[PDB]
Amino acid sequence: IHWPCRLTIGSNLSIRIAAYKSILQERVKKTWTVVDAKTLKKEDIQKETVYCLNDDDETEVLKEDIIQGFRYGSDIVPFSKVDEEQMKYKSEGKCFSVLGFCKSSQVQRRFFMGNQVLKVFAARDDEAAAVALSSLIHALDDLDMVAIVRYAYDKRANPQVGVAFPHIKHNYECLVYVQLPFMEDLRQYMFSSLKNSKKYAPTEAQLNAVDALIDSMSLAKKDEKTDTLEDLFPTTKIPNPRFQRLFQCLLHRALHPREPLPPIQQHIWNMLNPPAEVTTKSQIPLSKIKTLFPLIEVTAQEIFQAENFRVLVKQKKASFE
Amino acid sequence: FIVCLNKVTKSFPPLADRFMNAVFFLLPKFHGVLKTLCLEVVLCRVEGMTELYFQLKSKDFVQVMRHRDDERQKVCLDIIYKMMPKLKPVELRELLNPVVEFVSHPSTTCREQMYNILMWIHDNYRDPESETDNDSQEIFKLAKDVLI
Amino acid sequence: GVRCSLLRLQETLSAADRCGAALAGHQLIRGLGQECVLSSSPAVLALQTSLVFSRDFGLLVFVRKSLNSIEFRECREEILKFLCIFLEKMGQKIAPYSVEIKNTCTSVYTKDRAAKCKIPALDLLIKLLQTFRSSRLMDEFKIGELFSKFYGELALKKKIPDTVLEKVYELLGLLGEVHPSEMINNAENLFRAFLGELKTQMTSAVREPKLPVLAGCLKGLSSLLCNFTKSMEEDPQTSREIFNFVLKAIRPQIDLKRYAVPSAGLRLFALHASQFSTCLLDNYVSLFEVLLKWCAHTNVELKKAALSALESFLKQVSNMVAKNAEMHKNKLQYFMEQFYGIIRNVDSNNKELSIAIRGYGLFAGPCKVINAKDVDFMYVELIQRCKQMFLTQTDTGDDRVYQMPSFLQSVASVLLYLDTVPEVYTPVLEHLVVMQI
Amino acid sequence: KYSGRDSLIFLVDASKAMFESQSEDELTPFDMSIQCIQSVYISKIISSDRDLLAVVFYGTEKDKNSVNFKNIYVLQELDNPGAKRILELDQFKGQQGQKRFQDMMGHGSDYSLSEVLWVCANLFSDVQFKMSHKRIMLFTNEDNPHGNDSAKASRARTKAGDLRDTGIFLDLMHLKKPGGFDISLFYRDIISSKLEDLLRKVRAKETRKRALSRLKLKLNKDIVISVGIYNLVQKALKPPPIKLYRETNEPVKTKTRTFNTSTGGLLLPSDTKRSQIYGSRQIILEKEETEELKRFDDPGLMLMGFKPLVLLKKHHYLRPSLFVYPEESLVIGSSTLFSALLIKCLEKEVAALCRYTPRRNIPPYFVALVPQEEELDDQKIQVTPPGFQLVFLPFADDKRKMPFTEKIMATPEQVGKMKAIVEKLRFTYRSDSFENPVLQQHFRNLEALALDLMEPEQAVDLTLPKVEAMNKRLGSLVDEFKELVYPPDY
DNA sequence: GCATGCTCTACTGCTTCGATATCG
DNA sequence: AAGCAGTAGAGCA
DNA sequence: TGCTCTACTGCTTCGATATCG
DNA sequence: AAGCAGTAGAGCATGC
């Protein structure tokens, strides 16, 4: 997506600019049509919706007799649409204007709220605007000077404020964009303190045991005499397993149209599991901490599933006597 | 709170008086056997309180002398046999209005308590002096009419 | 005593300070409907029916002039929990007042939103339709619309919770039991709505089962199968499916509590066993094991609802082995050696072996088809077994009088079949049955 | 508890003087009190709309109460903020409202003392809910209401203690008679002025604290502890509509169904299949299979090793972070192990990595548990509570790839003037306050609809910048910053 | 030696609220 | 259920 | 035989709807 | 999820 706008500082600094989207939640674009049994056709059923009343029966109303209201205190206030269409906010087209700046990084990790990330790059077409903004990023990168943007999509959209932090990358340095919470979002309360705990104080034997466990269970190691860390088990390259499960199950019912559900393949669990050499390494300290810490503490298809003794010797029996 | 307070107060009276202004705060909230437990607390320290009547009539005593039980409606009359000889007849004549709906009651102990408060309200409201108002002469007119 | 406690109950409906009046309503109804139960005289009981069921005041205009509210809900629950008992202290002398009770229940169901005031207004209607039987009034309780309402409400209603989907599923079968003259066209479209749900609640591998819908669907199928039988003769697949679903509902299960799925599968078995008879054959081992297992479950209703299932099992396989006793010889020998192994034991309970004795007297019949002498080995073995247990040995120092019924029933069931009664044991047989007299 | 609502009795002094303008011409303290009470109801009708709010004037001529005391007159009763109750309330403004106060109840009497607190006590006793806080907010000026009798003073400080012990706490917004902090007198015993926090400051807020999930943390084999995943940034939105029958204004009890197999007749849900066509042919399933093809794991967090805090790049992002905490409700002895693992993770700068399944049937999802430590001083400032943080992590098809193929640089001279501009626009960021204009204008739209006052109170747009206070703030360097090297040059 | 009568405790379902996924 | 520019088929010349 | 309107149009973002803890 | 509120079931004490 190339989203176009004009980053204006003050009222005069015009920078023609485009922003592309980045890391976002992904789903699948084919929902389940509801057909009927024993004819197997889409159009064979149709739904209806009616609004009756609360009398002795269903003395109905119609579509031309319904207004929306809102809860307000201890009643519902009427006056549905032309009211709340006339008295609506107007966003005056798209807006990509700088609100302010900041230096002290009280903008941090845990306060982002925005379920995408907009990598705001540049523009094309004789890039005076892009050399201007690369001067802007080349002035923001060498300090802690973050930027704060006001961004909204269109006139129907909702207004947004967001962090703009420069980058760390060789081939480009294009500015990031996250949204930010509002004064009504950030609820926060009082979770208890753990340090001056007279009942839950850990013994330093348990401290060094857990330290031994952490040393036994690492996942990234510095090797190869470049003296940098290189990571085993990176959880940012694995494809998402639920659409592969859906893919092979639909393949299965498309091929063999009587068979039950196949259970999950084995290499999927191998891929979603770590290399168990760290399990073999941690076999000892996990048993250690399990000994040294004190005493901790149905599906439907699974719920409902003389001479008599003489002839006794002569025929066949056990041993004698 | 009220279960153990009732246990301690059934054997010891004067530990109520630290909490006597905090049983009445709870009393319009217990719609069960616990209300009988609060009234069992209340009866220990009635004979000696200052007023009691404003708080009792503010805490809706009328619609709780008229629920359905035998223990609740027995303690609800033992307190009223306690607080006769300190009230004024402007309010005893509104107390004698729902206590004479016990002519058509079962459970002979409850009727015995009723014909046990009326037996004093006749003998010590006979007006041994000359005349009084239209309340100290009307309570006798409604207690000479159930004792017949 | 009443009608003052009814005019004041109508006085606390229009007055201000509501929720100070709802508690007055609860206080009045609990004291009215308690006096109106402890009354043994048909004079005052002949009055109080017309006071309570009046049309000016009285307990049926309250729930139509206090229904579009929310504060009165304890009161509108208490009325419908009292009328289910005032239909029991009385009987069929509420014959005129009955279409009004039916209209009260149908409107209190369809206008309310709770689910603690839609349960007692479906206990009242079930007890009503089970007192006024196949009789005259069923052309006034209009079943041809009271079905279409409660059958539309399984499609045109989202998330009817649990214990309302119980009683809907049971009331959709009571209409096929009593008054089956109007349900010819719409009991064919009810077996599908009893089988689809009962499949979904027991074979779905995504969720956990809701047991108070299984109880309701089994108790509804167990009364639609009266008067609308589906034997294994004309189309024996639906009865196979009903046997498979009752058979998943009685597997030798895990340890449980809340016994209301086994105690409804067993009672669907113990009445309508005759419909499925071919399919009852090949599972004789496991069925016999589980019914003997459940026969002593230390729960004083699960025993009573397991014993009749065992009796109907034995009695309904006996008339199949005694029809073709050539290929069923291994079945006959297996049941015989099992009853022998029960009776040779030295155990505690008398209902442990009384079922064995009755099973032996049952299977005395099909031995005549294969030997015609073993019947004569019986009725001498039986009478010799039967006399000295209680006649002579400890005539008064025993506690053994509790299996003589199975003794005399077994003796009669073997005595019917043979010819040439051997003439010597009859003056002890006529000490026996006069001892049971 | 959880569902223990907040209570508030407003108690106003209408005895001798405040009804008069204190021989001034500016604003009577009576009108000050009525404006503050109306603003508190208007704030809590959408801020905390489940709480309890009563209002009681004392010292007036005629009287009404359940106790039948002289010269104590209650107005409303303990219930929610109701629009009809505030439209009753707003009639006591100005001289005409003062005379309406006169003809309705009349001011001026021999005002008594602690019996007004007794009426407040019986107003709190008769509630049929549970209440967390009990606050009496007294709106008055004077100092000696026991100026003659000393037994009245002793009885006042006895009844105030009888409210002190059973959990009723009062504060008095001391009305300044000349407008200053003057009366340093002797009601510091009864209490446990500024009224701007009662006047404007809470136009949009909501009160809630929920646990969101209560899961188990397992160390990949058998070692299990408890954890509960609270929430911090929930992205609030306006409440949704209600259908309504415009004749009598009643809701209409929507019911829907599916029907008509091209003949007539219902379909109970047992006879519908779930299908997906793919070009020519179909693929049919059952509802239980199309719900079963997403099942991977038991619900919880299985641990898969440890990584340092540095190599996870905290700009990879798709969902807001949640916040764990070690309960001792499922297992016992879990805060000990989590405190030990937290201090060792802190002193070794390492973070946990986990596989996460929230509910009883959800496909698995990789998360990173990054620690944090608290901070506390004498002022009790609270920006961090002592737990972890669940950074969600993308898998593979969240990241797109931009076309990237441009690279042209310039001269390193504009960085100094841009440093001057950003230092011109340098300030501390915030701690709050960038409120949502759409939700706030909708709030005031609904206020003016249910109260029919005048107009939409146009909300100020704090989200917008200050271009007047920015352009002349920076000054005449914008022309040189525009035209050093880059004018567009035509 | 079997049936019943009576209490208390733990299981279980409902109601309200808030968050999440889905379908236009 | 509503808008925003992108990409090939028509109208005057 | 040549450049602007125009039908579509893929997408994208709220807004209503349904599920689940 | 959170709170609560109502009923099923098991074990002691009694009776025929």
PDB file of C-alpha atoms in Angstrom, chain C residues 261-336:
ATOM      1  CA  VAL C 261     -27.987 -39.970  32.203  1.00  0.00           C
ATOM      2  CA  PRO C 262     -27.759 -43.655  33.315  1.00  0.00           C
ATOM      3  CA  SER C 263     -31.082 -43.384  35.134  1.00  0.00           C
ATOM      4  CA  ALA C 264     -32.805 -42.337  31.921  1.00  0.00           C
ATOM      5  CA  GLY C 265     -31.057 -44.628  29.474  1.00  0.00           C
ATOM      6  CA  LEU C 266     -32.005 -47.574  31.690  1.00  0.00           C
ATOM      7  CA  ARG C 267     -35.651 -46.496  31.862  1.00  0.00           C
ATOM      8  CA  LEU C 268     -35.844 -46.068  28.114  1.00  0.00           C
ATOM      9  CA  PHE C 269     -34.611 -49.654  28.033  1.00  0.00           C
ATOM     10  CA  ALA C 270     -36.880 -51.136  30.734  1.00  0.00           C
ATOM     11  CA  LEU C 271     -40.119 -50.127  28.993  1.00  0.00           C
ATOM     12  CA  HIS C 272     -39.606 -50.051  25.228  1.00  0.00           C
ATOM     13  CA  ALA C 273     -37.330 -53.073  24.961  1.00  0.00           C
ATOM     14  CA  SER C 274     -39.501 -54.956  22.487  1.00  0.00           C
ATOM     15  CA  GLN C 275     -38.874 -52.614  19.551  1.00  0.00           C
ATOM     16  CA  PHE C 276     -35.232 -53.663  19.229  1.00  0.00           C
ATOM     17  CA  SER C 277     -34.893 -57.445  19.578  1.00  0.00           C
ATOM     18  CA  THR C 278     -32.521 -58.569  16.821  1.00  0.00           C
ATOM     19  CA  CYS C 279     -30.013 -55.916  17.876  1.00  0.00           C
ATOM     20  CA  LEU C 280     -30.404 -56.994  21.524  1.00  0.00           C
ATOM     21  CA  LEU C 281     -28.880 -60.409  20.759  1.00  0.00           C
ATOM     22  CA  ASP C 282     -25.169 -60.111  20.010  1.00  0.00           C
ATOM     23  CA  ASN C 283     -24.333 -57.799  22.927  1.00  0.00           C
ATOM     24  CA  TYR C 284     -25.635 -60.217  25.557  1.00  0.00           C
ATOM     25  CA  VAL C 285     -22.314 -60.606  27.392  1.00  0.00           C
ATOM     26  CA  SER C 286     -21.524 -56.908  27.869  1.00  0.00           C
ATOM     27  CA  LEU C 287     -25.161 -55.990  28.476  1.00  0.00           C
ATOM     28  CA  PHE C 288     -25.481 -58.644  31.175  1.00  0.00           C
ATOM     29  CA  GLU C 289     -22.221 -57.510  32.781  1.00  0.00           C
ATOM     30  CA  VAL C 290     -23.190 -53.844  32.959  1.00  0.00           C
ATOM     31  CA  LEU C 291     -26.730 -54.478  34.176  1.00  0.00           C
ATOM     32  CA  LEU C 292     -25.465 -56.701  36.973  1.00  0.00           C
ATOM     33  CA  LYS C 293     -22.911 -53.970  37.666  1.00  0.00           C
ATOM     34  CA  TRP C 294     -25.475 -51.166  37.944  1.00  0.00           C
ATOM     35  CA  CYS C 295     -27.790 -53.552  39.838  1.00  0.00           C
ATOM     36  CA  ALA C 296     -26.061 -52.775  43.181  1.00  0.00           C
ATOM     37  CA  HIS C 297     -24.896 -49.166  42.814  1.00  0.00           C
ATOM     38  CA  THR C 298     -25.733 -48.252  46.489  1.00  0.00           C
ATOM     39  CA  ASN C 299     -28.117 -45.519  45.268  1.00  0.00           C
ATOM     40  CA  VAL C 300     -31.745 -46.116  46.130  1.00  0.00           C
ATOM     41  CA  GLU C 301     -33.094 -44.979  42.784  1.00  0.00           C
ATOM     42  CA  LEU C 302     -30.438 -46.394  40.471  1.00  0.00           C
ATOM     43  CA  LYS C 303     -31.078 -49.876  41.863  1.00  0.00           C
ATOM     44  CA  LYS C 304     -34.827 -49.472  41.378  1.00  0.00           C
ATOM     45  CA  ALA C 305     -34.278 -48.291  37.805  1.00  0.00           C
ATOM     46  CA  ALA C 306     -31.694 -50.982  37.005  1.00  0.00           C
ATOM     47  CA  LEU C 307     -33.556 -54.049  38.280  1.00  0.00           C
ATOM     48  CA  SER C 308     -36.501 -53.654  35.923  1.00  0.00           C
ATOM     49  CA  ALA C 309     -34.063 -53.209  33.045  1.00  0.00           C
ATOM     50  CA  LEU C 310     -32.396 -56.493  33.945  1.00  0.00           C
ATOM     51  CA  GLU C 311     -35.751 -58.290  34.213  1.00  0.00           C
ATOM     52  CA  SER C 312     -36.880 -57.019  30.839  1.00  0.00           C
ATOM     53  CA  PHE C 313     -33.521 -58.015  29.363  1.00  0.00           C
ATOM     54  CA  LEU C 314     -33.824 -61.629  30.528  1.00  0.00           C
ATOM     55  CA  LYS C 315     -37.513 -61.877  29.631  1.00  0.00           C
ATOM     56  CA  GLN C 316     -36.984 -60.406  26.163  1.00  0.00           C
ATOM     57  CA  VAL C 317     -34.086 -62.642  25.186  1.00  0.00           C
ATOM     58  CA  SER C 318     -35.906 -65.738  26.509  1.00  0.00           C
ATOM     59  CA  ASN C 319     -38.673 -65.451  23.905  1.00  0.00           C
ATOM     60  CA  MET C 320     -35.995 -65.341  21.198  1.00  0.00           C
ATOM     61  CA  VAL C 321     -33.950 -68.332  22.336  1.00  0.00           C
ATOM     62  CA  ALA C 322     -37.162 -70.333  22.946  1.00  0.00           C
ATOM     63  CA  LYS C 323     -38.244 -69.675  19.362  1.00  0.00           C
ATOM     64  CA  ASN C 324     -35.286 -71.234  17.541  1.00  0.00           C
ATOM     65  CA  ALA C 325     -33.341 -73.242  20.123  1.00  0.00           C
ATOM     66  CA  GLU C 326     -30.898 -74.858  17.670  1.00  0.00           C
ATOM     67  CA  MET C 327     -28.370 -72.109  16.954  1.00  0.00           C
ATOM     68  CA  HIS C 328     -28.839 -70.365  20.322  1.00  0.00           C
ATOM     69  CA  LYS C 329     -27.555 -73.342  22.311  1.00  0.00           C
ATOM     70  CA  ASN C 330     -24.341 -71.571  23.301  1.00  0.00           C
ATOM     71  CA  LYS C 331     -26.393 -68.601  24.529  1.00  0.00           C
ATOM     72  CA  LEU C 332     -28.604 -70.934  26.543  1.00  0.00           C
ATOM     73  CA  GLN C 333     -25.610 -72.756  28.017  1.00  0.00           C
ATOM     74  CA  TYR C 334     -23.862 -69.481  28.871  1.00  0.00           C
ATOM     75  CA  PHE C 335     -26.846 -68.017  30.692  1.00  0.00           C
ATOM     76  CA  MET C 336     -27.337 -71.330  32.515  1.00  0.00           C
TER      77      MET C 336
END
